Design a protein around this nucleic acid. Sequence first.
RNA 1: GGCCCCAUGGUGUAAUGGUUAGCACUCUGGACUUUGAAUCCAGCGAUCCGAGUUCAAAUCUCGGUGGGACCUCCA
Lengths: 538, 741, 685
Amino acid sequence: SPAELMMLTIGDVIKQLIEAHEQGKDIDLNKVKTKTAAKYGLSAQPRLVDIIAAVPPQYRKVLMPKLKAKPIRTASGIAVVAVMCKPHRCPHISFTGNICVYCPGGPDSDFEYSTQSYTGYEPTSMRAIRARYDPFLQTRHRIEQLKQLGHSVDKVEFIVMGGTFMALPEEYRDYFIRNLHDALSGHTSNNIYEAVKYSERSLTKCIGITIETRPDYCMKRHLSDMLTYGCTRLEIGVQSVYEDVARDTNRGHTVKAVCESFHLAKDSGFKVVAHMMPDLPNVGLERDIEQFTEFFENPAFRPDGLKLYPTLVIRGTGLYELWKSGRYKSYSPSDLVELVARILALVPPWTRVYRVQRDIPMPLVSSGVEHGNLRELALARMKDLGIQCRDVRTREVGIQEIHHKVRPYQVELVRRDYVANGGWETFLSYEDPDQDILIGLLRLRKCSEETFRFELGGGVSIVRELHVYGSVVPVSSRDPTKFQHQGFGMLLMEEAERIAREEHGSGKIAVISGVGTRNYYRKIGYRLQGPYMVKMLK
Amino acid sequence: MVAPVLETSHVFCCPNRVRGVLNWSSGPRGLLAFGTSCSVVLYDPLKRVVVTNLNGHTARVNCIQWICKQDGSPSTELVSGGSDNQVIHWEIEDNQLLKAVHLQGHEGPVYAVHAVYQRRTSDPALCTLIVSAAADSAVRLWSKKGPEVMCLQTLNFGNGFALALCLSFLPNTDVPILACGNDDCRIHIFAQQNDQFQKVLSLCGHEDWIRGVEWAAFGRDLFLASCSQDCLIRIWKLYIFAVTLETVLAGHENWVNAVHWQPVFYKDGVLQQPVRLLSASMDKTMILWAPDEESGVWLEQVRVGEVGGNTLGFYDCQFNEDGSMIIAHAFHGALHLWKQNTVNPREWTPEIVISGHFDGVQDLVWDPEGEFIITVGTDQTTRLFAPWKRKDQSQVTWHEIARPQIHGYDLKCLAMINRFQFVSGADEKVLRVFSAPRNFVENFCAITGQSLNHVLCNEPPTEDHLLQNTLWPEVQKLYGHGYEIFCVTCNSSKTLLASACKAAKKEHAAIILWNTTSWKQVQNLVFHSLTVTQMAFSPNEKFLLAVSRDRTWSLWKKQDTISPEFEPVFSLFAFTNKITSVHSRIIWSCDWSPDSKYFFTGSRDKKVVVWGECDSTDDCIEHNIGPCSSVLDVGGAVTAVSVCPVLHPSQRYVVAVGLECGKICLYTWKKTDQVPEINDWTHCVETSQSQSHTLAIRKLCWKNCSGKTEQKEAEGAEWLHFASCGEDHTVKIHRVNKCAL
Amino acid sequence: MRNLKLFRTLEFRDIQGPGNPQCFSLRTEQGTVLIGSEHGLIEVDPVSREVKNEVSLVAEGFLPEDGSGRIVGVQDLLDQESVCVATASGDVILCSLSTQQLECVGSVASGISVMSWSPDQELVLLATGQQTLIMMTKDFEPILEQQIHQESALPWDDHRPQVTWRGDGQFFAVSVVCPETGARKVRVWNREFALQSTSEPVAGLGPALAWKPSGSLIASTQDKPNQQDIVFFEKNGLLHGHFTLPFLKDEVKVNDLLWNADSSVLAVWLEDLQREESSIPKTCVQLWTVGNYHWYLKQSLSFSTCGKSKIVSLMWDPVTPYRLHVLCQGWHYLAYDWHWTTDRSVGDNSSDLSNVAVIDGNRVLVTVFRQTVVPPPMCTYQLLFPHPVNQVTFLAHPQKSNDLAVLDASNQISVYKCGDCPSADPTVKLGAVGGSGFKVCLRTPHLEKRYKIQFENNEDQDVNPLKLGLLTWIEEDVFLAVSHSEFSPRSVIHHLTAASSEMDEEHGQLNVSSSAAVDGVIISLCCNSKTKSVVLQLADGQIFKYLWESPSLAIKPWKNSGGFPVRFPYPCTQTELAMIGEEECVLGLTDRCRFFINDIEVASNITSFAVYDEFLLLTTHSHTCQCFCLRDASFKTLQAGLSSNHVSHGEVLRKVERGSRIVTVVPQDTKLVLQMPRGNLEVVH
RNA sequence: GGCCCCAUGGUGUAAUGGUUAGCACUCUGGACUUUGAAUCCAGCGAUCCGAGUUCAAAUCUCGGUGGGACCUCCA
Ligand SMILES: [Mg+2]
Ligand SMILES: [Mg+2]
């Protein structure tokens, strides 16, 4: 077949890319394919992945920057790896009888071999099913795909997905945690502690893990279990801020439990991401806008993250009968886009929005969403109405380089202060004032008088996150065009130390680090006192 | 003799998960040594039958290394390791465990061991030198100066670790040398001077963890294989004593896990000194590097590799005594071997090896005719073991020939329905039933030698035919149970099936009966309050029992049938409350004597109660059911009880009682027919540390050879063959002499 | 955070009326107030003390002459000159004015209880005495009539229905004591009588009801075991929070609740119960507010309960943002005006620590911004007082600009002062910077004196709860306050000198040692920090210089550069004084975003500004802050720089977010504190 | 060797001097911290090669390059 000539095409195309590089002249890529594709008799332009595939070692090293496919996987600062666990029943079906109304799929649903809330057809689902829910295989597959695309996986970030992660026995959970840490590091451990200790000295650094949970399985014991695992971020389903809704939907808990979980998690040192759920089947539009104004105004709900989710009706669920019988009529697309525009206008300047729309395919959804591009339509309507969206997901350096073209020219130190679920927090950042471009951030806090961890008692200020945005520069590398190794972290630590020892009036500064980042803090002057990095400031 | 003997016939197992657990001794008829669960297994590839086992460890075994004989004789000593923080030295002779020394003092599981016969001139009889690197951020140096052991030295690598070690001797002398790599992307050389190991030099090599080092003394020169993790092998040299860097040969694309020089060998008196190199990596390939004939630069020779499914590469590989074969240990647990084709050295052909589940085997079923066994375990796999004929030759071998299910759930139970039918209780709410294709029966005819027309009533495969080209088709699917299945058992008539599921209330702890022909629920029997742990049907096919976690049982007797086509009904004839119960804790086993009127029970209270008395079947008017004789106290939590399916002259009732630790014990019982209820039980034969497991025992199923109703052809009619479905990955089959009448 | 301040009170007494007041309303375009008595309508003008129109309903056989009959309510009607009135006998009359024409426009058999006119007057709602509700069009053409009636009742509930409209007039809510359950119940309808919702069963519901103007929460009150709280319903009918009044159990009654013109300030009316045999009762009008969902208490006013002080009705001004009208029983008229501000300390740069004092009723939440930049709901330290606080101010001495002076309702001027030894007095409690282990090195003030104000003779003060406003602590011993004389526009400036020489005894005496008289209403007073010269703004906005150090207490008009009088084109709320090179200027700002250096407008889009030691900082309405120097700049230089047409560059301009308001300035750190409408803080350079 | 016809994006054909090119397969980018291959929306890309006639030609004359067709010499 001419496809055999196709690899000659690559065999020619590579022969060009290095050749010009030998004499150091940049060569255009689209037109070189076009030219050395009509001479060998091709009927399809080459795909970049096959070009990246067959390259000699040093030539791969020198042509990765000019042959990077989808330059957003490393434009945020980490490498996302999504894994799931075994199908299991949610832990409020015993004393209630039925799981939440709107949940699609699950172990006892009509979708065969379906994880809870993740029916059968999201990409992570086919990634995990063929591995039969084996963490080793899944993480290796994701890493090898990310290396196929031509990215650097030197900094990894795990996300466990599925149902709830606490309704499982101890053996299965520790099996997951050790397998993940060993897969990233290369060891073969027996318990969690050995896995963590070898992961600490590993080369491919780990940054942390994110777990989803219900607020009723978020207590002191569970927080201890997380802090042993190395987790550094937690997500709680906070559907609706109204008590009537959270009882009429068989949610199984109350808002007060959610507020208490917020208090405990933020006092311990985590970062919490809420799952709000517009268009619940009793609420309405003005009620939505009021509940979101309350959620971003009440100093008992202010998170450091958000993940919106418009309602979708799916067969074999509680909402399906209500829709069929003549209740819970949906929203028209225009008013939905208007509403989403209003929320994104209300979003505060320190909350990062991750996801706006569900990944559910068109044939599955019976009603509720037409275009799987709601964020861009919402932003267009913002620029239509004159209002502005000013979160950090649309102001970090990486995003506003692929979008637009401008780059920071003058950097300044902005500081914000707040009142969280009962603690006093600060927010330091280096960013461009005149252009609204963010670079790096920090999150201090003064622990309240309801802490339950021994290390944080007696005059302790905690740091929950450090993150400098840009492009993923591997460890010990130095590049003068990216931003991740220019020296902002040292200045942020200096100012955080000054704040914690002069304004907070504290005695200990503690950092909830990951595992691969631990060595980093050892060059600052910190120590280890458990799952924390402490330092005497006096 | 008067006291019958117990012997273990067959063992099936495989290496565990860990890197470095493999070795061949350098000598004729060298013995392969690997590690399964918490034991070391010696097996000869040529015999294709396991040699023996060397128990004594407690945790998972990590690394095993032989100690070669300098002359070239088969090795004697065998240094081991484990995750129980102790290093065990072994001494073998005539395939029997001679000596075992428990060296201890490690605060952390060991990962690297290396030793060699030291050659001091002050008549140091069998003076060795053991080195062990563990998870204690330190390495220890030992010595077995005869029948005594003492720790020589301890070196701590700060908060780092140690990953590879080897000992050798400097040229023109006998000064010890030690190559110790670490996670510091670096290897160190320590030479023993004065009387303490010192620091000599610090090489700057790769940029990843070193997953192996190896010395090679050729002529008067030293060559150091320095395998790495960043796809880079690096050969060094050491000459009179500075070290120099040499060829940096590469060609792998993933982590490279092992490297081993081909060892010297004696061919017709003259020793041979080959210069080659074998390695394995995650990339699912093996590269055999040899230098060019004219130029000294190293080049690839062969690219032997495995293509099955989408599994990963290999953790270890071993070459041979001289050059004949090659073995590699896969990821999921597998052994791939290849011998060099005489016509083409670059050509290599597969062979036959052993296998087994890589997790605890939960259940086992013997074939009704008695020629294959089906085993199911937590490894989410079902394996069928059958014999083979090695042409006109003795020592018939049983080994894997099929793999009906590679299902993705955690299977827990098993049941036969017919000659080729299959029911598996997974970790879901559905019972899945299987049938057999014609390829299986055709291959079974081709292998076992039984005629095709006879098997249908008118070489064994390798890793490729089983993992990819073997799957028994599913025929139906049974719903109805609201929770995961926990106990499955059929009846001897292959008509009624019974199932039980995990439960926490009375409604969920109800057993369900199904018809074989029309697969619909015959009846639902409700009793107890927790999950029914064990169940089986009566040999005369009119009783039932449901000993469960609630420390009770059930006696669901059969009711008379008026209409022939009507499905039979069951009624509760006897029961037991907390007061009537004699067991102190959870019950986990049951079996009936094949006398239709007595049965056994086994709990976790270390007591075996033989309460039967289910006689006078025709005139069973009231309940006269209770304890039958004295309660035996073996001394451990009994997990499985079974009764041999044949009766014996002096009213003998022989039972194979297991325990928590593998302690398969044969007991013999008879009612005293008098108010003295002592000495009714007698003890026949125990099991030693060579015929027993190292972990739990799950099912001691016997062999009921219904094909041999009468002993047609026998070698004396004195043997009984039974199974031990253990938890330490072993499916060992035992043979026991019974009697002589 | 900011707090309210009283700056204008208008009191007109003894209106010549035949009977006694029963209801009243306003005519905002004319500024005249209508008062429906038990005899006939009366039209009054408070700024001139006259009664122009006086209709006699009794004469024209409408109001019975026996001495009874209730006017349901006087309602002014827009784009006209007539008034729509009602009578408890069950009639609605469209009585005109001037021409004295009185025509019967509606008659119903059963009597009428309450009249409710929507914020736009095209649909009116009436409630009958037969327990039915009539919806009428603007021209009194009938539209519809539907019945209201589709643990026990509170004892002093008078069974009087109240009706509330939304701000936009789309929905309304009816409060009725349900005969079945004998409990308060709320029903919500839309414009065309669609039954929107019914309230949830709640025990102990009060009688009050006031839908929020913008509209998300319906105010009400509930008496729970051991407390009395104000609860907020929503349109659906369910409770969505509450807040607790600071009073004992079963002691005070809540009369009614009413909202501001922009859903900002909520006024609650409280009356003391006569449970004790004597139980000398008290009247409370309390002005609260909302911050970070924590309800501050900013003002508390105390009348006399019985006698010639019976408070008959209150009305928030529907047009003017912060203006409250009070009608007493003895034909008495009161008008109160307020405006927002914040209290901050300015002093020598080497020693001054910038401070913020925020009122929360009986506490003061001080925050020192030089060391601990603290969010609003938290504070550095906290001062506690026995009875609610009204006015708070800082000392104006250049080297001592950290000594607070807190005034309270019962007229007890405390003097909290910072010293070497903290003295460990319990009145100063650590805020968010104290606790076990947590400790920051700072010095907290300690109480020094509890001066008691003395007034001339032993008169009964007045029915006015407040007699002093705009207290200024110009010197450690000498204070300043201003009062308005009722009859003449003559305003009086007092001198509350320290009669007590030193720390002789607690409960010292402050004596009025002087009283200067200057014609015209005074709306604001300020003083210089270095020269300590005092500037007054008369009602017109004219700027008069005042000399307290002068024995004659002479008041001279402020002279501009050319020695001419200075007059603001408009009344100026916030005023400060600056030292611009070699001239002193009366910097000022209006409610309509105007800057008024001397008398010349130099901007038209300013939201908030602040002047510190040669540093003028401004927040334009274009979301762009600015900062100008004053060390060597000139009036022309500032005019040209702030001309708004000179090109803006990066050295001065610095963008901010939407609605940022400057809080304070930190010079030595060169830092600025901004508060957004959400509530948080931001620091820039 | 004349003879008659043809050449358009990588590929398939559209379009008669206001000159100044649209559709399909294919490729690339964003929604996406659940995805190179799915959905939606945007985008990169052509009139082989010369002289010219007409103010002006993917459109007309002549060329010479490639392809197709009739009688071809030729070996
Ligand atoms: Mg074409
Ligand atoms: Mg793509």
